[PDB]
Amino acid sequence: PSEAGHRLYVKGRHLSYQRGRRNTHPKTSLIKIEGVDDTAAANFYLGKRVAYVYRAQKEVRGTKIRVIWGKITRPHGNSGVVRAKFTHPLPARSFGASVRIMLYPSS
Amino acid sequence: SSFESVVVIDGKGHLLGRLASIVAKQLLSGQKIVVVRCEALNISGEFFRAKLKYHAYLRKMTRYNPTRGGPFHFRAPSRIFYKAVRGMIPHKTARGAAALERLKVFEGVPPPYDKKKKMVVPQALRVLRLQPGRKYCTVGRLSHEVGWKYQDVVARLEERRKAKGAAYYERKKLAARQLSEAKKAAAAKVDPKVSEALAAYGY
Amino acid sequence: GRLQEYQVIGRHLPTEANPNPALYRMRIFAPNEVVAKSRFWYFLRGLKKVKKATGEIVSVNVISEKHPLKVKNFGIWLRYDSRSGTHNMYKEYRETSRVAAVEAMYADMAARHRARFRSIHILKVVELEKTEDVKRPYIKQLVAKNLSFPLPHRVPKISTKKIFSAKRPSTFS
Amino acid sequence: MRYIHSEETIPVPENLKVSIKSRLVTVEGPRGKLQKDLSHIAVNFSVVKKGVIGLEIHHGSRKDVAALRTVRTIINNMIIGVTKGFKYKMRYVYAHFPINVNVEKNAETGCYEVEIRNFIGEKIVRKVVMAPGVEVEISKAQKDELILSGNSLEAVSQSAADIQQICKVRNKDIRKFLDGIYVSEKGNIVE
Amino acid sequence: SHRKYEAPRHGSLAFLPRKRAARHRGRVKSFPKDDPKKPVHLTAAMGY
Amino acid sequence: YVIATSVKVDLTGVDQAKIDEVAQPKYFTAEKAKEKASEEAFFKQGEKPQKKPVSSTRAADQKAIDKALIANIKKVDMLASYLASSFSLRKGDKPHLMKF
Amino acid sequence: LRSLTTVWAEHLSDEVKRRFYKNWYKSKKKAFTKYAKKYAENNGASITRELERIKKYCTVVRVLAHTQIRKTPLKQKKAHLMEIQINGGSVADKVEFGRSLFEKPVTIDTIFEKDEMIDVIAVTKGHGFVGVTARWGTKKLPRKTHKGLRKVACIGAWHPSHVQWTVARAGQMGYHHRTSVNHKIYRIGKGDDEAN
Amino acid sequence: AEINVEATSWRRVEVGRVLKLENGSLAAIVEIIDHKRVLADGPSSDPKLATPRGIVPLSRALLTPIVIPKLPRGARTGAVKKAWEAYGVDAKWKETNWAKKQLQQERRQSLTDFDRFKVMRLKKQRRFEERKALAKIKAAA
RNA sequence: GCAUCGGUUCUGGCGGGGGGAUAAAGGCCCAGGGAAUGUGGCUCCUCCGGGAGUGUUAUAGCCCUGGGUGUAAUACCCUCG
RNA sequence: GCCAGAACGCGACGAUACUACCCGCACGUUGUAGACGUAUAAGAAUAGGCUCCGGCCUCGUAUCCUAGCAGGCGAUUCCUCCGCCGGCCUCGAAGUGGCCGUCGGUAAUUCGCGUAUUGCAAUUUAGACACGCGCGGGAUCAAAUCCUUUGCAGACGACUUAG
Ligand SMILES: [Mg+2]
Ligand SMILES: [Mg+2]
Ligand SMILES: [Mg+2]
Ligand SMILES: [Mg+2]
Ligand SMILES: [Mg+2]
Ligand SMILES: [Mg+2]
Ligand SMILES: [Mg+2]
Ligand SMILES: [Mg+2]
Ligand SMILES: [Mg+2]
Ligand SMILES: [Mg+2]
Ligand SMILES: [Mg+2]
Ligand SMILES: [Mg+2]
């Protein structure tokens, strides 16, 4: 009886902030999308929405789960890593945490 | 690229520094890694070169109190690899400590990671990285010569696990033969329409 | 760099005492025509009493390889400056064009004698028409009869983003 | 310079078989069987004729090509040891003290053992154990001679070298004190 | 500057943690190497 | 918020007039305030919640449009099951590579 | 090495039971009461299971043995318990030997013999806090030394800027664990021998 | 003299050897330049298999088991094409296992969403019979 | 959130035009001349793959030169959208 | 060999009153360096291997699984897979898997009713690790320290003993 999954997003990992060797800039983040390994592949995901989903302590308005929303802005480097801009910068304790790259602005 | 729950790396045939670099990058990216058979890792160059490097390492020690602060020289092959990885990890931060906690290293193949799929890293494999004819040594041999005390125990346990794996492999071959026979027999009972459709689709 | 042979023809500025001055032609291997003209003026300063300020460039043309799809043996006579003197040496290359031979020459000189572009003078580049005038063993073994060889211990091509592999690769293809 | 091809050939006489698998050479003939692991050298073996083994190195440098003739000679030595064997003859030399030599085969192991006494007149008895497969005997043909015979030239010569090195004079003019056991003849058991 | 007259150091660093023993009863840190050909036998005892 | 696949369903039997009158601007939101008010009156005053009643006009238009559409869909062997089954991403599914 | 399991005898004496207690006088002395039932339940099935496990897996076999301190003139009643390795034979032989020795006395002439060279392990005589002169055997400073002559004059140079671990310092002396070796047994005398 | 040698047997870089390039096209070798480069051309009528005459670096090429026999060294495009058609290189390549694998990869990449759903359904239908046969074989032991 | 715009900007394709040896090449069609890492033949040897010699297209081909299709394509640089 | 023993390294064993231990559910006020199909054991060589012995090996670009109200109800038809508990038999590198049964659910085929209104998107609150609890039972009825004492010890703590 429906042994299938329900995933409609591509998974990614929050690698770091945009930075030099010593100076970091939290306003944009670096995202590694699964299976995206070049700029040509990364171009498909430009403009796609991204959610960082985490859990908090208090239940505020029917849930303990909070979301930070952003979108993919441009590719980064040559290996498919992308730059993402969120409404607020990501917590920076989430370096290595998972994010969901939606398909909401499709085609 | 693919995100796994945990990646088990069979350390045999890998170059220590390159595997350490790859593993450190994965750990900082958030991947969990278990490296087995750290005594079968390889270092390029002569074993005399490796031994001289470790002797130079051993010479370092805090002068005023060798029980604190000084470089603590770990003899086991998994600990040699762990030192190599910690060199590439920013271990003095909380983020680096978490990255290192995402890692496990062992000599031989302990039972949990026995009966599990062990990956390889082609960017660090000796056969793919070293010119044939160049000298190389074994981290297990270096550890044994610098004071690691369990080379023979690991060898005996690996022999036992390889005998068990040989029995498994025999039953696996039997299962493969039976599955091939089953597919051949069922090829005459499925719809030819289904068969042609799958063949056209590429299956 | 990626070079191209240029025919550069230059001239001393015509004067009342010397109308219609002699035209001097050189073959210059340069990445572009600016460098070609610069090298022409450098060599013309070396050889004759003409400068860029007292002369002009009559013509600059590209000399394309006439048979770039034919394998040839090339002999290059060159003069170069080491750290402790100047030397002349003759080397051989196996290429399909004079430009490719010169590029291989530059790379080989840089690799074997640490000779930079600034310290090499290409005296002559000649296509060796025959086979018995090939003098170097490393070209002779390439022009050996019925030549064939395998490619042992060849590393397969694996994407650098495929970090982990489920089976051990083979080096037999 | 890297040479495109370096080739060498070994003829195999009719009475012996040779098997090469994973660069592990096995040679079997009338006098026995020998094995040699050559996996440390990148060489390509093949059968070029009915009874000729070809061994080649492709795109090798001088250092790599230098090992081709070494491998040929080693495999040829294995073949001649398997067919005809190897025999080394040593001579005892001394000025005043007769060197006493006693050779016996161990009971618990197949190895031979040689004890040397009265070397330069000192009381220590020096004992050297031969490599397996090497037989030692006192020469019945002439006095003060040792005969070492075997299938492997490497083992025979190494046992002889052990015997030779175990008898040395120290803190003396070696130009004057010549006592020792020295290898005198190298040859084959047959012919 | 160098020590004027040479002399060996006082005491041994091989017993260096000159602390109270952790336990009153002596500890056998190593037992004689086993040999299966020999008859079964105890390797130690206690007394006062 | 949709992904357009390459499968096209035939539409010869569908009522274009019905489609346009459904496409009229006020079709979906004209009654919405009243339905929300009725739902609130049911929930707050009542003790147990019940399904919002579907408008008769909307049900009639649904049936009228869907009849010929289903008839057309049945002519493709597995299209009905394909439309009945949901879509999800499996392991190794790469949306930048999948043709859809 | 690691201990896979240990098997105990059915009955333990109060001498050895005292070793498991700090306040034996006011305790309920229940040390091995539940364990003793295993010899009666299922005809010692668990005991046999553990012995078979030791036979199957373990490569080192030791016996747990205790002293009969009540036979000494000592005022102590709490016995001393330790592991003694069985050497020789197979693991099955070791297990059989140890099991046959259960709650049984072994005499020291069955372990050692005359003219044997043995080792003695013990904690040395304890001195309290002791200065460097006796603790390390350093030279006494001259008589006219101010602020004490029973010291080390220089406890370190300048540049390392720390007192080093190799410098003699006052502290605990004696009461150290020592394994003295190569002691000859001159006689093993018997208690019942009136002329030992 | 019995000789058992079990060393590897590579395919040789030689005149007439057909190489498969990274883009999927085929080129016969007409002349060896050096240890690492050759001169090659694919005069195939099928545009998916044809390559222009030029230098091929051996690192970007794979050696197919097809060798055009008695191909002259340095032969021009016309002679190479004549030998290519005479030997029937396209048919032999199509029969090779590499071409079949490439065709299967192309077919699997060309699937749509409906195609993938139908593939799942048909694979389940075939798997039913496969499982029945496997259970029967297991029961027979 | 979407649609339609404006400013800045990053990035991917598509259609054209010009120049150079009016690219050089190359594919076919001729006209001439050559050689070898010499094809077919011929001689000898090897019968065990094959090797050696002779000689210029034959039962493969290649190189050089002058032409035609031809203001061919291409790719390079520039440029209009 | 010998000395120390990580005071945030590990093992075996003994007794464990109680709020401590064991069994089932009943929630979760509480936490997580971060589930979303968290699916895949040969060993070995890489100048060689695998095999069902016919043949295969650049390529995990693979294999498995994957449809149904977040997955309903009832048929047709299926004997194929998933689990739940119980015999057992083997699993010591840091305790593992199995074939033998019960009990459930189960599109390989075809259908018949239900889905709407969450209003054009808004994490898909869905998992396993826990941890602290209350139900209502079983099991069990303990130690340690202070204190007095000893001197194999000791500046005081500590330690060896005895009560
Ligand atoms: Mg030291
Ligand atoms: Mg510390
Ligand atoms: Mg003298
Ligand atoms: Mg003294
Ligand atoms: Mg004074
Ligand atoms: Mg705009
Ligand atoms: Mg001829
Ligand atoms: Mg025209
Ligand atoms: Mg044109
Ligand atoms: Mg501790
Ligand atoms: Mg059932
Ligand atoms: Mg005292």
Side-chain angles (χ1 to χ4, degrees), chain C residues 134-151:
Chain C
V134 164
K135 287 161 46 124
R136 293 288 134 94
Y138 53 83
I139 305 294
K140 287 177 177 179
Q141 73 164 353
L142 297 180
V143 306
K145 181 186 169 185
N146 286 313
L147 178 68
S148 68
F149 48 86
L151 300 171

Side-chain angles (χ1 to χ4, degrees), chain C residues 29-43:
Chain C
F29 287 94
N32 53 62
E33 76 284 2
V34 190
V35 179
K37 280 180 292 177
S38 177
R39 294 311 271 163
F40 173 89
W41 281 127
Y42 166 88
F43 286 119

Side-chain angles (χ1 to χ4, degrees), chain G residues 21-105:
Chain G
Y21 284 95
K22 253 54 188 176
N23 294 291
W24 166 268
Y25 71 105
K26 65 172 182 181
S27 83
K28 300 301 166 73
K29 307 170 180 173
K30 282 203 174 179
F32 273 80
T33 52
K34 266 71 172 292
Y35 189 94
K37 317 286 218 343
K38 295 155 86 84
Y39 278 84
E41 296 165 337
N42 286 80
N43 208 241
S46 61
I47 303 298
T48 304
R49 181 177 181 170
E50 298 311 310
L51 292 172
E52 288 305 316
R53 188 198 308 284
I54 290 172
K55 283 181 186 170
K56 193 175 195 292
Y57 295 117
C58 302
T59 67
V60 158
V61 185
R62 307 193 177 154
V63 297
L64 286 154
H66 73 83
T67 61
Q68 296 191 89
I69 197 169
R70 79 187 193 284
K71 302 190 173 193
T72 63
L74 300 178
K75 262 54 196 200
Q76 181 174 334
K77 313 171 185 179
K78 178 188 298 188
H80 289 102
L81 165 74
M82 81 169 249
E83 293 176 12
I84 299 162
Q85 195 171 104
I86 312 166
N87 275 189
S90 69
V91 172
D93 297 324
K94 293 169 167 71
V95 173
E96 207 61 35
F97 182 74
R99 181 177 181 170
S100 86
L101 290 183
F102 265 16
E103 33 193 342
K104 218 151 295 303

Side-chain angles (χ1 to χ4, degrees), chain B residues 84-137:
Chain B
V85 176
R86 203 191 79 171
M88 298 142 197
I89 293 263
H91 62 101
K92 286 186 176 168
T93 57
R95 172 177 170 257
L100 280 169
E101 293 177 350
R102 290 175 200 124
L103 173 66
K104 297 202 227 292
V105 282
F106 302 98
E107 290 95 25
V109 195
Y113 309 105
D114 180 26
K115 306 179 185 172
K116 268 176 204 283
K117 184 60 186 173
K118 302 149 204 71
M119 290 324 177
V120 293
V121 178
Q123 273 171 53
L125 280 177
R126 177 184 47 76
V127 294
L128 305 186
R129 291 303 317 194
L130 280 196
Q131 216 152 61
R134 290 288 189 199
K135 310 289 189 55
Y136 63 89
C137 69

Side-chain angles (χ1 to χ4, degrees), chain G residues 176-190:
Chain G
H176 304 312
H177 181 283
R178 286 299 183 269
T179 304
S180 69
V181 303
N182 281 332
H183 300 296
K184 203 152 188 70
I185 295 184
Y186 274 12
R187 171 169 289 197
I188 303 193
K190 322 300 311 320

